[PDB]
Each structure stands twice: as structure tokens, then as C-alpha cells.
Design a protein around this ligand. Structure first.
Ligand SMILES: CCCCCCCCCCCCCCCCCCCNC(=O)[C@@H](CO[C@H]1O[C@H](CO)[C@@H](O)[C@H](O)[C@H]1NC(C)=O)OP(=O)(O)OC[C@@H](COC(=O)CCCCCCCCCCCCCC(C)C)OC(=O)CCCCCCCCCCCCCC(C)C
Ligand code: HAS
Ligand code: HAS
Ligand code: HEC
Ligand code: CUA
Ligand SMILES: [Cl-]
Ligand SMILES: [Cl-]
Ligand SMILES: [Cu+2]
Ligand SMILES: [Mg+2]
Lengths: 319, 63, 780
């Protein structure tokens, strides 16, 4: 089970904002004690015995008290605000020399491009621990929002512009990611993973990715892929001239399928290929029910062969 | 900080001019000319409100 | 049938109030059922009960129905229409036919929204917020949702203007604003805030509709439009709306506290100042809904600041409510229970609200169940509890029957317990990173299944509460003990009437001395004996079919707009029928006999109603112009070479300014008894307006042939704002024409000329707005 929490100190963002929570808890505790306590007292103390017909003392207020219970809350918000501004300024500060990663949202999946590396992957974003990253985010259709709670707050993906968020992953693991802007029928199925590896291991994955082409583990499979899939899917692990579907060149390294909604396994892959819509309402990929069982199996072998060796992302701690 | 204070000032002026023209005492004013007065305040209120909001939208793009 | 014809034609504020109230609470029950479908789907991971588009449809209907058809109605248009005139010691509202029209338009809006079910694409599925460009692209019933919002806007604005005119003009002689019940102040504050701010939603709604129907866009990045500008417009109203939803309920809480504590209101002046404070700040915080959209840090910090300030005026209000209870002799009747539930829960609701204002934290909390918990905390356990405090408080007054206290209390505890169990787990879910608006979730995320199951159990407990609530009302109406004039021992004027009140409200003449905001208290001490009213001075507004007919034909106009490509023949057919209806309405006497019209201010109700409605016009043009100024100054919108010529706008300025002078002098003559000169000036004004319109039309035709609003942002802005102004010329022109038809039938006299005062003032406004338009669209 994934231990998803906005308080998890997996990234520099969650570590940097953490100091706000105790202040919130403290003031809220005091405010509750006083105000809720007073109201509790009132209901116990001033209940009226049914026989009582004598009206209580008709007091109209307390001018001094009005001032105190205006200024004290005011002071509290000034403190909260002061802490808030300090924290906001720090987490929005750009980090010089951070590896840029271009994030692009589609209905209903996520595309990733590492411009300095010349590398493309989809739905699972691999990152080095201890290294600052700058996410450059946009959309090709409607508004989306890129959210990895275990690492950092979200930033919207808005068509026609580029938004950004910077942070430094610290703790290696497999992080759940969600789209956090209602984008259509499969909003709840527009997920992803952030794979955080030790820097040394990250440098290896990227090197192997760009070192040689994606293997061909089944030739009958490569042809079936060419006749049915290549039209929408690249396997070259780099930006195609026109993007239609996700990159499949690193498919065999993917822990999840369908933009992170189900485990990547041969059985899940078959079901997906036969009827994507059955898993993602409104999904923009046709099913392939005609394909012979022989072709589908051959196709799955080929797909699962599109990878680099020596990595096991499914063994990372789950966040 | 200067622009935020300018925004606050805008809102205060919008508030003030609404008060000056719409409080119960001023609305009892008689004369065919009050209609013109009332409407010219609205003209000014449009400018004040639009400018105040426009200011903040532009601040939104001033990274 | 007899009861139907009565309701279709009534102008009695009490019946209108009951209709609003019953409709609003029906809306709550309908949307509550929707919430049960939602929570059933969410009870376990990977559920297949309600999925995808269907879930998003139910979700959208749940939220919009609760916000637009329930919470912002019950405590405002419902209780308010019934109770406010009584509290003011009046016999009706300022504009009884307008008031009825506002109810029927409300019902019309509800029908528009729900009927989407029967059309291709069904109900809207884009969330109540209908974010662009998602809402521009959807096949779902977005058009019906947008039409509904626009139709509803007419109901709200007219209703708000009616409330404020009623408060200014109909207060019992001797009662200054500062002697009114706190609830009236809160209805006052809510109405003013609503009048000014609705503009944001009107703009956002109109612009998405125009885009879907005729391809005119302010938001499309391909022409330099700004998708985020849509959110700026939307939230410019959609924050203020929640304070419009809060103020009346705080007013109710204070009223209930005073009555059931046998104490006067603690810090009455401070309570008013706090509501004023909330109205002002309420319009300066909208962008805290937009923290994650990539606006500058300075912009974000600005909104975090003003948002946190809101906590101060609100606290002061709550503290004063608690002060009202303090030292009292608490009668533990049902309404007081709701009040206590409100206050205890609102503390957490407001606190989490402030947590959300802390921008860094909001980066996490945004679009997660933490937000969902926050707003149900303040809308359900807050306003909602307020609504039920109000329902039980005024139930005897509205129905003439007492309810069973035992059932009332059972309803309360079920809602309390159910509320906690439903929504406390949702705060936790937010901490656990659960996004909102997800029809389903996986099973390999720790905590989610357990917390979601608990939440669903809570929701079913609220369901039970709902059954208990319905039974309670049913039992009360069928076998309940008949209600006395003043069952709780209240001190405000609504308790000086019968239960329910006679048609004319007060059988007695009221004293003209109000030492405080508790007249029943002060008069009883002075032994003031109240004398019966002379039935000769009692005149009730006549029933009329035209408000309903007008709402019906406008409803049909909006159906033709929603369901078909624009424009179409049906739009025109129903607009024509609608115009006909308004002509009959304008020629129909308010009363059967002659009547002495005296108001507190000296200004007619027509004048006063128009002056407050015009506030909404200022708002609408202000927000649209702000958007335009922003797009142009940022370099996005630049005029094409073929822009309409300046000389043509100056000619038009001459026409329009002249028309303001002909109409002014036309009114002047009416004030002198010279009727032919008056008829003539009015007619001249009308002809001048027509000329302005014909000139604009030709200019629009020409400009349309030289520049596409699909390819040029400035052109889109021009047609939008100058076009909208053109529509105003038509409306104002028609208004003047109504007055002229009145003059031709001898309905205009030195005595009665309200329609003329309103139309004239609205015309001057059209003139003023033109001057701003010339400035920013033809000069600049
Ligand atoms: C694309 C097309 C667009 C169309 C859609 C837009 C549709 C707009 C819909 C507007 C709905 C407005 C609701 C109508 C309420 C007013 C009804 C008017 C008729 N009633 C009256 O005049 C009198 C007759 O009684 C009077 O005279 C009697 C003597 O006989 C006396 O006995 C009575 O005592 C005396 N009454 C009084 C109070 O003194 O009835 P009442 O007593 O009830 O008084 C009621 C009045 C008196 O004064 C007036 O009514 C003046 C208002 C004139 C405006 C009419 C415009 C109609 C549109 C025509 C369509 C074109 C067809 C053209 C051809 C086809 C023919 O008060 C107000 O001003 C209250 C304030 C009203 C607000 C303005 C609304 C402006 C809308 C702007 C929209 C912007 C869009 C902003 C955005 C949302 C867009
Ligand atoms: C009736 C309905 C509502 C009321 C009232 C309301 C009040 C507030 N709200 Fe809210 N709201 C937000 C902030 C506030 C704040 C700061 C207040 C205040 O008006 C509440 C003030 C009341 C109190 C504060 C209690 C009494 C005051 C006392 C007792 C004084 C002492 C307290 C102090 C000094 C503060 C201390 C605070 C601490 C945390 C220590 C923010 C954050 O900036 C979001 C964004 C969520 C997101 O990111 O999408 C938001 C979102 C919503 C949405 C979601 C819309 C959607 O569909 O997306 C709804 C429906 C809603 C309703 C309502 N909201 N709100
Ligand atoms: C004032 C406005 C609101 C009220 C009140 C309200 C009450 C509830 N809500 Fe809600 N809400 C949710 C659950 C509940 C539950 C369990 C209750 C309860 O307090 C409701 C209690 C009321 C009842 C349980 C009704 C009982 C009535 C009965 C039993 C009468 C039956 C008899 C009848 C109907 C006779 C009539 C029939 C005839 C034929 C006469 C959930 C789920 O857990 C979501 C998020 C879903 C997602 O994916 O994010 C949510 C989201 C929203 C949103 C955001 C919408 C959006 O994202 O676009 C808004 C504005 C909103 C407002 C409001 N909500 N809510
Ligand atoms: C264009 C019409 C496509 C055809 C032809 C093929 N695929 Fe596709 N695929 C397409 C899109 C737009 C997407 C993203 C969908 C979403 O919203 O999630 C996909 C996705 C996949 C996936 C999941 C990839 C992931 O990272 O989770 C797989 C495994 C996949 N597609 C396989 C696949 C095969 C085998 C195809 C040939 C039979 C094929 N696709 C064709 C669009 C299109
Ligand atoms: Cu993409 Cu929701
Ligand atoms: Cl910045
Ligand atoms: Cl005039
Ligand atoms: Cu808000
Ligand atoms: Mg969002």
C-alpha cells in the first residue's frame, strides 16, 4: 500500500512548508479552547429552569470587550500571514541550475521530456534524489493539474502557457501522482508515478535509455505493432514530430498502465489493448478486439521487451 | 507592496463613492438634477471599479 | 385548480416567500439524494455503481442545485420575502409584481438546469465551476446550465433590488435603519453584495455561452485570449456568493439567540459594522481560488492577506452572538439547538478556511478533499444549520402550526452526528492526498477505503435525518397544535401578527416611537395600547397573471437558446410574446382604487427599485471593462486597421446625449402639468435612441465584414462590450416605449409615473456607459 500524505518529507517542498503546521495547530487549539469552551460554559451555566419567568439582566454589550475580541484575532492573522509570506517566497524561489523537465498534459495522460538529455518518456517520471528539478508544465487541450503529494504541492497545466514548480526530491521511492483539475470523464484515471532513484542509479537509467535502441523481443510482435499501434505510439524514447499517444520505448520499465491506474502485467495489458474504454471512460484510444490471440500475445511480448535492463522500480518504498 | 496598497485604495474609493450616492439621506434629495448626479457617480464608479480590478489582473502577470 | 390560479397570480409577499422556501428546501432534498448516490459510489475503492461521465453529471447537479437553488434562497428569498416586510411593519414589498416575477424566473432556472436530462449529452458534467476550455468543449448539457444561470440572474437581481427598496422605502414610520432587526440588516448586506458582484458570473457565463454558440472567445490562447481570465471573472462573483449565503444566516442566528435567551442583542452596532466589513472584504479575495494557476507571487500574497482579514469581521460577529446568549435564560427549543450546532462547527470551518488562505499549504490542499470538507463544514454544518434554525424558528409563523419539539431535536442530532461522520474523515482524506471530483479511487492507498467508508456511513445517517425532517413537517401540518401569534416570546414585529398573518399583515396601527430594535419589548413596558387599523387605510396590491406569463415566455426564450443553434426563429417568437406580456403588465393598475403613495425617502418604489438594480449594471460593465483593459494593456488585444470610425461614435454620442436632455425636459414638463410637451419629448427621446441603434447596427454590419471575432481578440471584445451596450439601448428604449404607451392611455399622471422615473433613469445610465465605451473602444 502506498503511504500518500501531503506531510511526507519526500521533497524539499514538504520539508520547507512543514513549519506552518505547528503554528496552525497551536492557534486552532487555543481558539477552540476559548471560544468553544465559552459556548459550552454558556449552555451549562445559563440553561433555564422551566418554571423561571423572571427575565435575566438586559445588558446591551461591553465596548471594551469588543475591542479585545477584534484586536486579538487581528494579531493572530498578522502572525499567520507573516509566516505564510515567508514560506511562499521561499518555495517559489527559482533554483539556479536545476534539471529542466517538460511536463505536458493530455486527456487523459502525462508526457515527459528531458530537454538536456534528449529523452522522452510517459506517465512515469524518473528523477534523481538530491538533485533540484524544475518542472515546466503545460497542456495540449483542457486545464489539468500536476500533483505529487508525497513530494510537493500542485501546479495547473494551462493551454497556451507554461507554468513551473521547482523542488528537490530527497527520499527515493515510487510516488503516486494525480491530475488535480477536473478535465473530463477520466479525470480520476489521469494518474502517474514519480520514480525517485539515488542519483547514481538515475544517471544509469538515462544513459542506458539513450545508449541503444529499444530491443525487439518478438518480431511477429514488432510487425503487429507497426500495423496497429505505431501510428499513435513512438518507441524511440525521444520527441516525435507530432505527439499523439504516450511513448512506449520504455514500456517494460513502467510499473503501471493506463496513466497509472492499474499494474503493468501481461494480463492487464491484454485487457487494456482489447478495450481501453472499459478502464477509462472517454479514452481516446480504440480497442482491438479483432486481433488474433496469437498476435496479441506476440504483441505483448514485444511491448514488455521495450526497456532497459537492471532496474526494479516496483521494489522502491511506496509513497 | 505599493500596488497592493493601490488596490486597497481603489476598493476604498469604490466603497466611499457608493456610500456617498446611495445612503438613505442622500436619496431623499429632491430635484430633476439628482438623477443626473446619481448617474454621473455610476459613470465614475465604473471607471474606479474597472481600473481597480484591471490593476490586480496585471499584477497577476507581473512575475 | 382554484389554488393553482391563486398561486400563479399572487403578489402577496408571504405566499411568494412560502413558494421560495418550499422550492429551496425541495432542492436541498433532491441534491441530498444526489449526494447519497455519490457517497454510495465512493463507499469502496474501484466501485462500479456510478462512474465516469454519469458520476460527473450527478456531481455537477449536486453542487449547483445546493448552491444556486437551495442555500442562497432559503434564508434570503424564502424567509426574507415572508419575514422582512413584517419585521419592517409593512403591508407588502416595494415591488409586488416584480417580486412574483422573480419567483417564477427562479422556478424557470431550475427547470432549465434539470431538463438537460432529456437532451443529447444530458446534464452538464463539467463541475459547478465549468472551467474553460473544458466547458467550451463538453458535449454535456452545458448550454442548459448556462441558460439556467442567466435566467436565475434576473431572479436574483430583481429580488435584491426589491429587498433594498423595501428596506429603504417601507420601514414603519419612526423606525430608523438603526432600529431594524439584525436579520433585516443582514438581508440588506447580502442583497447589496449580490447586486454588485453577480457581474463576474454573468460575464463568465455569457462568454462561455457566446463561445459555444457563435465562436466568440475572450479565453482562447490561439488568439491571445487568456483561459485564466475565465476564472478571474467566475470567482469575482463566486467568492462573494458564499458571503451572500452566510450573512442572512448569521442574521438568523442572532435573531434566534436574542429570542431564546430573553436578552437584547449584544453589540448591535458592532454586528452591523461586521456585516459591512464582510461585504467589502468579500469582493477583494476572489483569487484565493486561483493559487495554483501560475499567477505572480505578489498577486498570490495580496490575496492571502485580504483573505485572512475576513476572519476578523466574522469573528466579531460570532462573538457578539455568543455575547447575546451570555447571561440569558436559555430556552432549549429546537431553533436554539441548530444555533449552537452552527457556532461550534463554524469555528473549525472558518479555521480550515484560513488554512486554505495560506498559499504554500493550499498548493497541497487545493482540489483535494480537504477543500471539500472545509466547504461542507461552512455550507452544511454552517449555513445549512442556519437554514434549519430559521425553518423551525419561523415555521409556526409561516404555517400556523406548531411542530413536535421531540422530532425537531431528533432531526438535529441526526444531522449533527451525520455531519461529523461524513466530513471529518474528508479532512483526513485531504491530508492523505485524495483529489476531489474522482468517481473512483484505487485500493492500494492507505487510509482511503476506511475513511471513505466512514464518510458514506455518515451520509446515510444524514439520510435518516432527512426522513425524520420530512415526517416532522408532515405531522406538524396534519395534526399539529394551532400556532399562537408569538409562540417563543419574540420582540420583533413579525410576532405582532397572527399565525399565519392575515393578508394585510397588521390589524393594528403601529406606534411611531422605536427606542430600540425590540419594539414588542419597549411597547409592553410603556403599556402602549395598540389601536385597530382603519380598513379604509388598508390597500392591498392586485393579483396579476403577467409576472408568471413573462417568466414563462422568457423561460421559453432561454430553452430556444440552450437547445438550438443561435440565432433561431423561436428566440424571436418568445421574445415577441415576452414583449407583449410586458406591455400588458405596464398597462395594468397596481391597485383597484386610488391610493396615497408615501415612502420613507419620498422617492417612489419604482425609482428606488431601479436605482438599486442599476448597481448591478455598474458591476457588469465594470468587470467586463476590467477584463478588456487587462487584455489590451498586456498586449493581447490590439485593434485591427478596420476598427469602427471615431466620427461615427461622436455622431452617436450627440444622438444619445441629446436624448438624455429631451427625456430630462420631458420629465420636467410632466412636473409642470404640460402633457403634450411631455408626450413629445418622450417620443423624441425614443426616436433618437432608435437612430443610435440603427447607426450602431450599420457600423456592426460593416465591422463584421472586415474582421472576424474568431481570429482577433480585440474584435471579440468590441462586439462583446459594445454589443452588450447595444442590447441595453434596446431594453432602455423599450422601457421608454412602455412609459409612452402609458401616456397614450392616460396612465401617466402627476400622481402616477413610476415607470417613467425608472425608464428615464435607466436611459441616463445607458447614456453614461456609452461615454466610457466611446473612450476605450473608439478614442483609445
Ligand atoms: C438577444 C436578445 C436579448 C433578450 C434577453 C434579455 C431579456 C431582458 C429581460 C428583462 C426582464 C425584466 C423584468 C420586467 C420587470 C418590469 C416590468 C415592466 C412592466 N411593468 C410596469 O411598468 C409597472 C406598471 O405599474 C406602473 O404603472 C401603473 C399605471 O398603469 C401604476 O398603477 C403602478 O403603480 C406603476 N408601478 C409603479 C411601481 O409605480 O409594473 P410594476 O408596478 O411591477 O413596476 C415595475 C418597474 C416599473 O418600471 C419599469 O418596469 C421600467 C423597466 C423597463 C425595462 C423593460 C425591458 C424589457 C425587455 C424587452 C425585450 C425587447 C423586445 C424587443 C422586440 C422583440 C419587441 O419597477 C422597476 O423599475 C423595477 C426594476 C426593474 C429592472 C429593469 C430590468 C432591466 C433589464 C436589464 C437586462 C440586462 C441584461 C444583462 C445580462 C444578463 C445579459
Ligand atoms: C458559506 C460558505 C463558505 C464560507 C463562510 C467560507 C469562508 C471562508 N473561506 Fe471558503 N475557501 C477559502 C477560504 C475561506 C476563508 C479564509 C473563510 C472565512 O470567511 C472564514 C472566517 C471564519 C472564521 C475564521 C471563524 C470565526 C473567526 C474567529 C473565531 C476569529 C479567530 C480566528 C482567526 C484569527 C484565524 C485563525 C486561523 C487559523 C488557521 C489559526 C479558501 C482559501 O483561501 C478556499 C480555496 C480552496 C481551494 O484551494 O480550492 C475556499 C474554498 C471554498 C469553496 C470551494 C469552491 C469550489 O467548488 O472549489 C466553497 C464552497 C467555500 C465556501 C465557504 N467559505 N469556500
Ligand atoms: C449548500 C450546498 C451543499 C450541501 C447542503 C451539501 C451537502 C452534502 N454534500 Fe456536497 N458533496 C458531497 C457530499 C455531501 C453530503 C454527503 C451532504 C449532506 O449534507 C446532504 C444531506 C441531505 C440529505 C441526505 C437529503 C435528505 C433528504 C431526504 C432523505 C428527503 C427525501 C425525500 C424526498 C427527496 C422527496 C422529494 C421527492 C418528491 C417526489 C417530492 C461529496 C461526497 O462526499 C462531494 C464531492 C464528490 C467529488 O467527487 O468530489 C460534494 C461536493 C460538493 C460541491 C462541489 C461540487 C463540484 O465539485 O462541482 C458543492 C458546491 C457542494 C455543496 C453542498 N453539499 N458539495
Ligand atoms: C491512436 C488512435 C492510437 C492507436 C492507433 C493506438 N493507441 Fe495506444 N494510446 C493512445 C492514446 C491517446 C493513449 C493515452 C490514453 C490515456 O488517456 O491513458 C494510449 C495509451 C496506450 C497504453 C497505455 C500507456 C501508458 O503509459 O499507460 C498502451 C499500453 C497502449 N496505448 C497500447 C497500444 C497498442 C498495443 C496499440 C496497437 C494495438 C495502440 N496502443 C494503438 C492512442 C492510440
Ligand atoms: Cu487531467 Cu483531470
Ligand atoms: Cl513570481
Ligand atoms: Cl430626469
Ligand atoms: Cu472564496
Ligand atoms: Mg483547480
Amino acid at each position: 500500500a502506498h503511504r500518500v500524505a501531503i506531510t511526507h518529507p519526500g521533497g524539499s517542498f514538504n520539508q520547507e512548508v512543514a513549519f506552518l503546521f505547528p503554528w496552525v495547530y497551536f492557534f486552532s487549539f487555543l481558539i477552540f479552547l476559548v471560544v468553544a469552551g465559552s459556548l459550552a460554559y454558556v449552555t451549562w451555566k445559563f440553561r433555564a429552569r422551566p418554571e423561571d419567568q423572571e427575565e435575566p439582566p438586559q445588558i446591551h454589550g461591553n465596548d471594551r470587550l469588543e475591542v479585545v475580541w477584534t484586536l486579538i484575532p487581528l494579531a493572530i492573522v498578522f502572525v499567520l500571514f507573516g509566516l505564510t509570506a515567508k514560506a511562499l517566497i521561499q518555495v517559489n524561489r527559482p533554483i539556479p541550475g536545476a534539471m529542466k523537465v517538460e511536463v505536458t498534459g493530455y486527456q487523459f495522460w502525462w508526457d515527459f521530456h528531458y530537454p538536456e538529455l534528449g529523452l522522452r518518456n510517459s506517465n512515469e517520471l524518473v528523477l534523481p534524489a538530491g538533485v533540484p528539478v524544475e518542472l515546466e508544465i503545460t497542456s495540449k487541450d483542457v486545464i489539468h493539474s500536476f500533483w505529487v503529494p508525497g513530494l510537493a504541492g500542485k501546479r495547473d497545466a494551462i493551454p497556451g502557457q507554461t507554468t513551473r514548480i521547482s523542488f528537490e526530491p530527497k527520499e527515493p521511492g515510487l510516488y503516486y501522482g494525480f491530475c488535480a483539475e477536473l478535465c473530463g470523464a477520466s479525470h480520476a484515471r489521469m494518474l502517474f508515478r514519480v520514480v525517485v532513484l539515488p542519483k547514481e542509479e538515475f544517471d544509469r537509467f538515462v544513459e542506458a535509455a539513450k545508449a541503444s535502441p529499444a530491443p525487439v523481443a518478438d518480431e511477429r510482435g514488432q510487425q503487429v505493432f507497426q500495423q496497429n499501434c505505431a501510428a499513435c505510439h513512438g518507441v524511440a524514447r525521444s520527441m516525435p514530430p507530432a505527439v499523439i499517444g504516450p511513448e512506449l520505448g520504455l514500456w517494460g520499465n513502467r510499473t503501471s498502465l493506463g496513466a497509472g491506474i492499474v499494474e503493468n502485467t501481461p494480463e492487464n495489458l491484454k485487457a487494456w489493448i482489447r478495450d481501453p474504454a472499459g478502464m477509462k471512460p472517454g479514452v481516446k484510444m480504440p480497442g482491438f478486439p479483432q486481433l488474433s490471440e496469437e498476435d496479441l500475445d506476440a504483441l505483448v511480448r514485444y511491448l514488455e521487451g521495450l526497456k532497459v535492463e537492471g532496474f526494479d522500480f516496483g521494489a522502491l518504498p511506496k509513497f | 507592496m505599493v500596488y497592493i496598497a493601490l488596490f486597497a485604495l481603489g476598493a476604498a474609493l469604490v466603497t466611499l463613492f457608493f456610500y456617498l450616492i446611495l445612503n438613505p439621506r442622500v436619496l431623499t434629495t429632491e430635484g430633476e438634477t439628482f438623477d443626473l448626479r446619481f448617474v454621473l457617480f455610476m459613470l465614475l464608479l465604473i471607471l474606479l471599479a474597472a481600473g481597480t480590478v484591471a490593476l490586480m489582473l496585471l499584477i497577476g502577470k507581473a512575475h | 385548480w382554484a389554488v393553482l390560479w391563486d398561486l400563479l397570480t399572487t403578489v402577496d409577499h408571504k405566499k411568494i416567500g412560502l413558494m421560495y422556501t418550499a422550492t429551496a428546501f425541495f432542492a436541498f432534498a433532491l441534491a441530498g439524494v444526489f449526494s447519497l448516490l455519490i457517497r454510495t459510489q465512493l463507499a469502496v475503492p474501484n466501485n462500479q455503481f456510478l462512474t465516469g461521465e454519469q458520476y460527473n453529471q450527478i456531481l455537477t447537479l449536486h453542487g449547483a442545485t445546493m448552491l444556486f437553488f437551495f442555500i442562497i434562497q432559503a434564508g434570503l428569498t424564502g424567509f426574507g420575502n415572508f419575514v422582512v416586510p413584517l419585521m419592517l411593519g409593512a403591508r407588502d414589498v416595494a415591488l409586488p409584481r416584480v417580486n412574483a416575477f422573480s419567483y417564477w424566473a427562479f422556478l424557470g432556472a431550475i427547470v432549465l438546469a434539470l431538463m438537460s436530462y432529456f437532451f443529447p449529452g444530458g446534464a452538464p458534467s463539467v463541475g459547478w465551476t465549468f472551467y474553460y476550455p473544458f466547458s467550451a468543449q463538453s458535449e454535456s448539457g452545458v448550454d442548459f446550465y448556462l441558460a439556467a444561470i442567466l435566467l436565475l440572474g434576473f431572479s436574483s437581481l430583481l429580488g435584491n433590488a426589491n429587498f433594498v427598496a423595501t428596506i429603504y422605502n417601507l420601514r414603519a414610520q419612526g423606525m430608523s435603519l438603526w432600529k431594524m432587526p439584525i436579520y433585516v440588516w443582514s438581508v440588506f448586506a447580502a442583497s447589496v453584495l449580490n447586486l454588485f458582484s453577480l457581474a463576474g458570473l454573468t460575464a463568465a457565463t455569457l462568454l462561455v455561452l457566446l463561445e459555444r454558440k457563435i465562436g466568440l472567445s475572450w479565453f482562447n490562447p490561439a488568439v491571445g485570449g487568456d483561459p485564466v481570465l475565465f476564472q478571474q471573472f467566475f470567482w469575482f462573483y463566486s467568492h462573494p456568493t458564499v458571503y451572500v449565503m452566510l450573512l442572512p444566516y448569521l442574521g438568523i442566528l442572532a435573531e434566534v439567540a436574542s429570542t431564546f435567551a430573553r436578552k437584547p442583542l449584544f453589540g448591535y452596532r458592532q454586528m452591523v459594522w461586521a456585516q459591512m466589513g464582510i461585504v467589502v472584504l468579500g469582493t477583494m479575495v476572489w483569487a484565493h481560488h486561483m493559487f495554483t494557476v501560475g499567477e505572480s507571487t505578489l498577486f498570490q500574497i495580496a490575496f492571502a492577506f485580504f483573505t485572512a482579514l475576513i476572519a476578523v469581521p466574522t469573528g466579531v460577529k460570532l462573538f457578539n452572538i455568543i455575547g447575546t446568549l451570555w447571561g440569558g435564560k436559555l430556552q432549549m427549543k429546537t431553533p436554539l439547538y441548530w444555533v449552537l450546532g452552527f457556532i461550534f462547527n463554524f469555528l473549525l470551518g472558518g479555521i480550515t478556511g484560513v488554512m486554505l488562505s495560506m498559499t504554500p499549504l493550499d498548493y497541497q490542499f487545493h482540489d483535494s478533499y480537504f477543500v471539500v470538507a472545509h466547504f461542507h463544514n461552512v455550507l452544511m454544518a454552517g449555513s445549512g444549520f442556519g437554514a434549519f434554525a430559521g425553518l423551525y424558528y419561523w415555521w409556526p409563523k409561516m404555517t400556523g402550526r406548531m411542530y413536535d419539539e421531540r422530532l425537531g431535536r431528533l432531526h438535529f442530532w441526526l444531522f449533527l452526528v451525520g455531519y461529523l461522520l461524513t466530513f471529518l474523515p474528508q479532512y483526513a482524506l485531504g491530508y492523505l492526498g485524495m483529489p476531489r471530483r474522482y468517481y473512483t479511487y484505487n485500493a492500494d492507498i492507505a487510509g482511503w477505503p476506511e475513511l471513505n467508508l466512514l464518510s458514506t456511513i455518515g451520509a446515510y445517517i444524514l439520510g435518516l435525518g432527512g426522513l425524520v425532517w420530512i415526517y416532522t413537517m408532515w405531522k406538524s401540518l396534519r395534526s399539529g397544535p394551532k400556532a399562537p401569534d408569538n409562540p417563543w416570546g419574540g420582540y420583533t414585529l413579525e410576532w405582532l401578527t397572527a399565525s399565519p398573518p392575515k393578508a394585510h399583515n397588521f390589524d393594528v396601527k403601529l406606534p411611531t416611537e422605536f427606542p430600540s430594535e425590540r419594539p414588542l419589548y419597549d411597547w409592553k413596558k410603556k403599556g402602549v395600547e395598540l389601536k385597530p387599523e382603519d380598513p379604509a387605510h388598508i390597500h392591498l396590491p392586485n393579483s396579476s397573471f403577467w409576472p408568471f406569463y413573462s417568466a414563462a415566455t422568457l423561460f421559453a426564450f432561454f430553452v430556444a437558446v440552450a437547445a438550438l443553434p443561435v440565432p433561431n426563429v423561436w428566440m424571436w417568437v418568445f421574445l415577441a410574446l415576452f414583449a407583449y406580456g410586458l406591455v400588458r403588465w405596464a398597462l395594468e393598475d397596481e391597485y383597484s382604487h386610488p391610493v396615497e403613495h408615501h415612502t420613507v425617502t419620498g422617492k417612489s418604489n419604482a425609482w428606488m427599485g431601479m436605482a438599486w438594480f442599476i448597481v448591478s449594471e455598474v458591476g457588469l460593465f465594470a468587470i467586463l471593462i476590467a477584463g478588456y483593459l487587462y487584455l489590451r494593456l498586456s498586449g493581447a488585444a490590439t485593434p485591427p486597421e478596420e476598427r469602427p470610425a471615431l466620427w461615427l461614435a461622436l455622431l452617436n454620442t450627440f444622438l444619445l446625449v441629446s436624448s438624455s436632455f429631451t427625456v430630462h425636459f420631458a420629465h420636467h414638463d410632466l412636473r409642470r402639468g404640460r402633457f403634450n410637451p411631455f408626450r413629445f419629448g418622450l417620443l423624441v427621446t425614443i426616436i433618437l435612441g432608435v437612430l443610435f441603434f440603427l447607426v450602431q447596427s450599420w457600423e456592426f454590419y460593416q465591422f463584421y465584414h472586415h474582421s472576424s471575432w474568431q481570429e482577433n481578440l480585440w474584435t471579440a471584445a468590441f462586439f462583446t462590450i459594445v454589443g452588450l451596450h447595444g442590447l441595453h439601448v434596446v431594453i432602455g428604449g423599450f422601457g421608454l416605449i412602455l412609459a409612452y404607451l402609458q401616456a397614450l392611455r392616460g396612465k401617466i399622471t402627476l400622481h402616477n409615473h413610476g415607470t417613467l422615473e425608472a425608464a428615464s433613469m435607466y436611459w441616463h445610465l445607458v447614456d453614461a456607459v456609452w461615454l466610457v465605451i466611446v473612450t476605450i473602444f473608439y478614442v483609445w
